[PDB]
Write an enzyme that holds these catalytic residues in place. Structure first.
Site, mmCIF file in Angstrom:
data_model
loop_
_atom_site.group_PDB
_atom_site.id
_atom_site.type_symbol
_atom_site.label_atom_id
_atom_site.label_comp_id
_atom_site.label_asym_id
_atom_site.label_seq_id
_atom_site.Cartn_x
_atom_site.Cartn_y
_atom_site.Cartn_z
ATOM 1 N N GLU A 183 -3.767 13.468 1.300
ATOM 2 C CA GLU A 183 -5.034 12.984 1.844
ATOM 3 C C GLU A 183 -5.836 14.168 2.394
ATOM 4 O OE1 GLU A 183 -4.047 9.368 4.215
ATOM 5 O OE2 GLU A 183 -4.870 8.510 2.363
ATOM 6 N N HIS B 108 5.134 6.859 7.060
ATOM 7 C CA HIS B 108 4.906 6.497 5.672
ATOM 8 C C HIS B 108 4.358 7.730 4.955
ATOM 9 C CE1 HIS B 108 1.064 6.055 7.686
ATOM 10 N NE2 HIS B 108 0.562 6.506 6.547
ATOM 11 N N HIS C 28 1.722 9.141 1.469
ATOM 12 C CA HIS C 28 0.729 8.952 0.424
ATOM 13 C C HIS C 28 1.098 9.922 -0.690
ATOM 14 C CE1 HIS C 28 -1.959 6.868 3.369
ATOM 15 N NE2 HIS C 28 -1.298 7.637 4.204
ATOM 16 N N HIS D 125 2.957 10.899 7.064
ATOM 17 C CA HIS D 125 2.284 10.560 8.318
ATOM 18 C C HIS D 125 3.281 9.924 9.272
ATOM 19 C CE1 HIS D 125 -1.807 10.359 6.126
ATOM 20 N NE2 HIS D 125 -1.437 11.592 6.444
ATOM 21 N N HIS E 228 0.819 -1.203 0.000
ATOM 22 C CA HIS E 228 0.000 0.000 0.000
ATOM 23 C C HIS E 228 0.854 1.254 0.000
ATOM 24 C CE1 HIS E 228 -3.220 -2.792 0.868
ATOM 25 N NE2 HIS E 228 -2.635 -3.155 1.996
ATOM 26 N N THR F 45 -6.612 6.425 7.870
ATOM 27 C CA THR F 45 -7.063 6.699 6.512
ATOM 28 C C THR F 45 -7.009 5.471 5.610
ATOM 29 O OG1 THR F 45 -4.952 7.349 5.634
ATOM 30 C CG2 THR F 45 -6.289 9.092 6.699
ATOM 31 N N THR F 46 -6.575 4.330 6.139
ATOM 32 C CA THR F 46 -6.645 3.066 5.435
ATOM 33 C C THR F 46 -7.423 2.078 6.298
ATOM 34 O OG1 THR F 46 -4.578 2.206 6.358
ATOM 35 C CG2 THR F 46 -4.430 3.372 4.312
HETATM 36 N N1 FBW Z 1 -2.613 6.582 7.096
HETATM 37 S S1 FBW Z 1 -2.691 6.620 8.684
HETATM 38 O O1 FBW Z 1 -3.996 7.039 9.104
HETATM 39 O O2 FBW Z 1 -1.560 7.338 9.189
HETATM 40 C C1 FBW Z 1 -2.505 4.948 9.271
HETATM 41 C C2 FBW Z 1 -3.277 3.934 8.704
HETATM 42 C C3 FBW Z 1 -3.179 2.647 9.210
HETATM 43 C C4 FBW Z 1 -2.338 2.359 10.267
HETATM 44 C C5 FBW Z 1 -1.611 3.379 10.796
HETATM 45 F F1 FBW Z 1 -0.785 3.095 11.828
HETATM 46 C C6 FBW Z 1 -1.663 4.685 10.337
HETATM 47 ZN ZN ZN Z 2 -1.134 7.529 6.232
#
Ligand code: FBW
Ligand code: ZN
Ligand code: BGC
Ligand code: BGC
Ligand code: GLC
EC number: 4.2.1.1
Length: 257
Positions: free
Chosen positions: A103, A91, A93, A116, A61, A195-196
């Site tokens: 996002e 990570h 996006h 993030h 992802h 957000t995932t």
């Molecule tokens: N994209 S996020 O909301 O930062 C996120 C998604 C899933 C797991 C996580 F630890 C962080």
């Molecule tokens: Zn994220």
């Protein structure tokens, strides 16, 4: 399995994760004019000097840079947060083109990418317990725009050829996440979600107002990653962002007057 394509992307997630239509989903559009300065927010403290990075992983992802979270090292405190939140991973996006990829949006503007930095509330002992709690996580979000290169990002860029496909990882020790921050810590904050999938409503979002600048070449290397595994048809890892979701009964607060 969930993803970002036409057949498994954000518009489909609700069928296996019904919270996708919940009351505090993320991301959101940040209306800068309706966001209100909150004088009660305490000073924000990003304390990353003792961070211990470990590994970088292509999870199909995005790619995650993972940190030792077995003790208080890299921590996020202050601002809207009650207590200490430990950094576990960061990570990004990003888009297929520079005009999309973030996002969160700012007055509907989309940035080229969004970083993030994910932290969990130490009162709950472990990340897994934290994602059972309304205040379990804090995510520091940072927008990326394309311009001058970000020196502190180049080590990340330069390792991506070794984790091209889903399931590949590489050692990533001695990486300093302080090099990914902008100068100012002015921010907006609101309560939201991952957000995932699984889209859990556990997150205090802290979104910095000042973007970082990265070069076109840096973001182009993000776009050479693959969503697929080795030996499978190549699907470029691009457009791995969820669009803005309804704000519902929420207010966005600003740290700055
Ligand atoms: N994209 S996020 O909301 O930062 C996120 C998604 C899933 C797991 C996580 F630890 C962080
Ligand atoms: Zn994220
Ligand atoms: O090597 C990356 C970073 O790791 C931290 O544990 C050290 O205390 C920092 O001085 C260093 O910049
Ligand atoms: O009732 C007045 C209050 O309304 C709330 O919605 C706002 O968040 C506060 O800043 C304001 O003082
Ligand atoms: O700091 C993250 C990584 O940066 C570079 O790839 C270094 O060669 C490697 O040793 C280090 O783990």
């Amino acid at each position: 399995h969930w993803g970002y394509g036409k057949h498994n992307g954000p518009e489909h997630w609700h069928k296996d994760f019904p919270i996708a239509k919940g009351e505090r989903q993320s991301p959101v559009d940040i209306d800068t004019h309706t966001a209100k300065y909150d004088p009660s927010l305490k000073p924000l403290s990003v304390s990353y000097d003792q961070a211990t990075s470990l590994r970088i992983l292509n999870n199909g992802h995005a790619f995650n840079v993972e940190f030792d979270d077995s003790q208080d090292k890299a921590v996020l405190k202050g601002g809207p947060l009650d207590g200490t939140y430990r950094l576990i991973q960061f990570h990004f996006h990003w888009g297929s083109l520079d005009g999309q990829g973030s996002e969160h949006t700012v007055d509907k503007k989309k940035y080229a990418a969004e970083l993030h930095l994910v932290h969990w509330n130490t009162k709950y002992g472990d990340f897994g317990k934290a994602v059972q709690q309304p205040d379990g996580l804090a995510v520091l979000g940072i927008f990326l725009k394309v311009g001058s290169a970000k020196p502190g990002l180049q080590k990340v860029v330069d390792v991506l050829d070794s984790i091209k496909t889903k399931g590949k990882s590489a050692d990533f020790t001695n990486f300093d996440p302080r090099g990914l921050l902008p100068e100012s810590l002015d921010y907006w904050t609101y309560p939201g979600s991952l957000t995932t999938p699984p889209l859990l409503e556990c997150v205090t979002w802290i979104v910095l107002k000042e973007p970082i600048s990265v070069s076109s070449e840096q973001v182009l290397k993000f776009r050479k990653l693959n969503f697929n595994g080795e030996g499978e048809p190549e699907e470029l890892m691009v457009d791995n962002w969820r669009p803005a979701q309804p704000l519902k009964n929420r207010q966005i607060k600003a740290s700055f007057k």
